[PDB]
Amino acid sequence: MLKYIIPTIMLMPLTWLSKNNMIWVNSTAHSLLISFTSLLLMNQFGDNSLNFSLLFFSDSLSTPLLILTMWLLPLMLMASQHHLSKENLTRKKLFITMLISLQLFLIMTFTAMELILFYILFEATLVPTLIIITRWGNQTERLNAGLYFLFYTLAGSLPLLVALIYIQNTVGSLNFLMLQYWVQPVHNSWSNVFMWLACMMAFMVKMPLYGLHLWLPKAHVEAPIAGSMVLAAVLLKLGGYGMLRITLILNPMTDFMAYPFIMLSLWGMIMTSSICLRQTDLKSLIAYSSVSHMALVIVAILIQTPWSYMGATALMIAHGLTSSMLFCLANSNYERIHSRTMILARGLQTLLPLMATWWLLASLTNLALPPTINLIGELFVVMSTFSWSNITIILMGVNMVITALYSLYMLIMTQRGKYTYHINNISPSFTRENALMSLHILPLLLLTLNPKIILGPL
Template sequence: MLKVLIPTIMLIPTTWLAPTKQVWPATLALSLVIAAASLSWLSNAFEAGWSSLNSFMGLDQLSTPLLVLTCWLLPLMILASQNHLSPSPPNHQRLYLSILTSLQVFLILAFSATEVIMFYVMFEATLVPTLILITRWGNQTERLNAGTYFLFYTLAGSLPLLVALLLLQNSMGALSLITLQYVPAFPLLSTADKFWWASCLIAFLVKMPLYGMHLWLPKAHVEAPIAGSMTLAAVLLKLGGYGMVRVMIMLEPLTQQLAYPFIILALWGVVMTGSICLRQTDLKSLIAYSSVGHMGLVAGGILIQTPWGLTGALILMIAHGLTSSALFCLANTNYERTHTRTMVLARGMQMVLPLMTTWWFVASLANLALPPLPNLMGELMIITSLFSWSWFTLALTGAGTLITAGYSLYMFLMTQRGPTPAHMTALDPTHTREHLLLALHLLPLLLLVLKPELIWGWA
């Protein structure tokens, strides 16, 4: 564990001590080395229990893929932000890189924590760097409003969780994830127990976000700089799913009765956010709403508590992390050239940047879950497990899948096809940096098709 955590912490002095011209190459090189080192964790992916344990941190099948995804994204965020930050003063650039690194440190500690309270503290700590990214480096003046939404939604959801965890600590004496599964189940009967159940889950459902508690997400995504959008879509939403899987063990047997409204909201959200996507004019907003729909499927898969649902949720979390991050990078390459996120004003890009259209095509197909990509594998496992739980769910998941295909193709056709507007004349050509960035997003996605057991969890 420490072979990745300590170099990540040392990235912060590296950014401040490196000569100005070497800051970006040095941090990128070191973060790529860290990402490569983290891949060694995948060799433990076939052990049933915990591995690499020390007093506070450990790996198991659930946390390993998410940790590798976290480490993989830091070099990609650095690559994506370089052009966007080149005009700002050197100290601002160093501060930006330090914030990205601190975010990664908190995420590594959150995903590998073996103690629930430590997980909670790190879960909350990720709020600070993300908030600074949105409110300091966002594009429009709306960013302060977006930051407020983000802060208050997350805090309002997670304060009940703290009380619930303290109550649990009081009654059980320990909150170690390693021993929690062996604790005898409580007969949770009273109304207070039902409130306790809800307060354990609400924080994670807000973070995921569940439809109905999702209003902070489109705002935060649209206003955040590119690295903020990437880390929000790829890793921070997964904290919610990961936390849900971890606390589900303690919430038996209440979940069978109380999960219904949340499953209904999640599946209704798949259809509703898909319909919202079909009407979007703003490219980043469309990608943000699509994340809500995909995470709704993940929430449904986790809440019905079947092995297939859990495996499908984990596969979809990893696949969605890579896909939506790639889509935000593509939206950013468009924005850096055209300075607009409105799709009507920046269409017909295929004539101007033909190679970028190939990346757009692959990312859009991944978003609509084309076989044999892991996106489809995750969605199919969740849809089948939901169908065997109740066949009514097929109406919602089927409609959701159809609408997802619709808006993914709409996004691709709106940005790439059609006549190029007259005002788009002198655009920069695509850079090797951008192609490398997209290759590093989409190649892992394609390679996971060959060895999906790395992200299967305990199946």
């Protein structure tokens, strides 16, 4: 990024500097102009590699990944205006600035050129997201969930500084991933096991496992106003890509102990899907779906040998658009019914026929309709782990069968009769409710036309 952080930091002295209610139409207007500058200088060729300028950017050469990072800020401001307009103007503008500040660290992140600038940027988040949970959230039991939102990610990430500086003083310098040509092998010891352990375990804190993931249905359950930072929390979970940066080198040959990370993420994969068919919350309903086929990608990486890097490149953005779109469905149907419990929503499909199409195609991306961006990568996870052994198709295939029920378990809940109630919930899906509901599948199937850019090195 030559000048990508440079225009967007100038957007910050524009919120409180501006007038009254013009601040929404002004902030969205400037924001889309950067989106072309993202597209233009990137997407170049391309053969190993594009070292961008200097010691602050390697241009995201092997995986682009950065276009998706920039849709969301001109996408959530139209969403957050549902229930925010009740406060002072100076307090509302602070809520605008902290979300814009969230993007700037993540703009320098995902490229990052290095590793010692990585970790300070890997931890540069969690400061604005935590404040969003504290002020202007929902009802109580927020503050413990704010503490569970800490004390896991910070608990696991601290041995990375134990790991990385131990590498920096030992073999060369980790400023350059491309000066990582000389890499000594790592043998089996009782010291080197922990060297691989601290190198990996912090990345399991963000993309979850069957262990240590109780915090994840707290921030999504107890969540801000109407899915406001919850959409950003989608990129916060998928943005643990850095295992692709690190373990591609830097003890690759330790696979003797890969197995309890293969197995735990596999029986826990089939389990946490069925752990929500008796859940009674809408915002928890997509949350446990977002565990399962996000836990699919982990066995695509620790198992090496591409035809596995191909799909895993695409499976990060797979639910990254989809679960963001499902939260947009769940952020709607709450300004009209002020409880998020799904059972009270009997008698839909007749009052809102226009958004009923949007329920269909959204949940048609979990069955996923094989000419899409979802079942084009899940076939390559099949193509990899079947070469591992012949058993792996069984537990992974039932995951394609449980979410078949688990997605249509939501769709049929819309179709009921006589609705018993609801002198409120009149509003027949205004312009903000459906224009914001667009621009998700509209690039998604667009990317299914020529899906060449969604591919790693690989």
